[PDB]
Symmetry: C2
Subunit: 304 residues, 2 copies
């Protein structure tokens, strides 16, 4: 029993609204008296091929923005563009506004997605920002404006707003200041994502979770060095492990009595030899979308 757990989504559900600008409807995020949504709400299908957002936004007035929050309708009394997000000032501050921050997460970190369609939640799931700054999400047409978040104590840290599906079926989006993660632009054009790599520090976290849960078959006698492990990681397109990464795995090393460079030697053997048809935590592949904090949080029963 060790599952991909999402944060409780209630505090975010109270902030989701529908944003319409002419034909185009998508999702928005209502905090205080501001509604944050992808700036392409102002594009026709045709416009998306090569949009001049400054020129399109100039053609728009407040009354070209229909924001609904359930049956309630909301009065747009202001618009500005910040990077790739539109901020619609509305007359009424959201009474369900949680305590919140906006944060820009690092590649390899995880967050919960509340997938929405026409401003209504469909579901909640946990996922990782890939090292190439894409997400392998589950999103359909109309999911744009869905948000990713983390919760600490009583504060929602919003880290992602969903914009687009790449022609390769992976997902790209912004921070809540409208800055893309990775090299992407909000235009319907072919765009290259980097080579993706496996998040090595997260695989090691998940192997510690496996030990805590009684799966120990993969443990071996040996150790190694960051320098030697990283030669094998490079060969299997694993991210290089740094001392920063060893430092973050410390508490899991302490709980299990398995030194970080010792678990790395077990990972090396798994990469070189495969799993020989056995499973770890009932997976036949190595899982990289659990961080060391995620493992500690889950294994120690942290609440919000």
């Amino acid at each position: 029993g060790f599952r991909k757990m999402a944060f409780p989504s209630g505090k975010v559900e109270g902030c989701m609204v529908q944003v319409t600008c002419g034909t185009t409807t998508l999702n928005g995020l209502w905090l205080d008296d501001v509604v944050y949504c992808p700036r392409h709400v102002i594009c026709t299908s045709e416009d998306m091929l090569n949009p001049n957002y400054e020129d399109l936004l100039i053609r728009k007035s407040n009354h070209n923005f229909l924001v609904q929050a359930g049956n309630v309708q909301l009065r747009v009394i202001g618009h500005s563009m910040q990077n790739c997000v539109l901020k619609l000032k509305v007359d009424t501050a959201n009474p369900k506004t949680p305590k919140y921050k906006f944060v820009r997460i690092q590649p390899g970190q995880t967050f919960s997605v509340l997938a929405c369609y026409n401003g209504s939640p469909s579901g909640v799931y946990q996922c990782a920002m890939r090292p190439n700054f894409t997400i392998k999400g589950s999103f359909l047409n109309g999911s744009c404006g869905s948000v990713g978040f983390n919760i600490d104590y009583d504060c929602v840290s919003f880290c992602y707003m969903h914009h687009m599906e790449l022609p390769t079926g992976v997902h790209a989006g912004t921070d809540l200041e409208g800055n893309f993660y990775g090299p992407f632009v909000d235009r319907q054009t072919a765009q290259a994502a980097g080579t993706d790599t496996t998040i090595t520090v997260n695989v090691l976290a998940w192997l510690y979770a496996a030990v805590i849960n009684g799966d120990r078959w993969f443990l071996n006698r040996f150790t190694t060095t960051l320098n030697d492990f990283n030669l094998v990681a490079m060969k299997y397109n694993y991210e290089p492990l740094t001392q920063d990464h060893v430092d973050i795995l410390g508490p899991l090393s302490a709980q299990t009595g398995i030194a970080v460079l010792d678990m790395c030697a077990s990972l090396k053997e798994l990469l070189q030899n495969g799993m020989n048809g056995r499973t770890i935590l009932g997976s036949a592949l190595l899982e990289d979308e659990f961080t060391p904090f995620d493992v500690v949080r889950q294994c120690s029963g942290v609440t919000f």
Copy 2:
């Protein structure tokens, strides 16, 4: 992109409370003016070995029940035992009570769990009632009273309350009327779960999801009959497929142009020959915790 999506958990988060009876604290569910919790809240560690619940409950008064809902404290003004659940009547009806039903689900059906500790949500995840009526949950000590649910439109259908971890590391619990799923009792004693089987109709649903998502490598020319497929299912400890199951897969057969008995022939080949180190929806094992409704719901973008 096809993930295990949980229901949005907000409407359930507003109903979770802490229930203390002397030393013992666990979680409870506050609907209208009734708080539902596992009847073993009235047991000491020692009592759990061989409890006489009628005799223990008689020793208890309302003032031996401390219910907290955040900082708010709640006044217990009544107690009754229904099967394996305690109903604590409280003076104040929950202002956050959603529209709700109590339902008894069938083996193979899925639901969302809101994992709680001291009446505070930790996380939300999707899981299946196994054919042997256990759940392979992610629960720690103090998770008892956590609930499982489904959401349709605006109504929460509560189907599970978590009671216990079996000495084998799987989970058992009740419906919200306090009736165990499966042969289990709320006593700290060794208890046999059946042989578990794989939920065949859910594997077929997930193979349809795979096709919809562009994974088609596993499709073959052949067909079969329920009678012939079921001979192979019996050998691989798969649940027998009935016409009821074929009827439920109809819409997915229609969407993909792959007849149900035709997908069954592909499953047969996968069971007999393995996956030869390839993946389906990035899994190297066959997934059985997505129902046909779950696949349709996700692939068609159903909201609440």
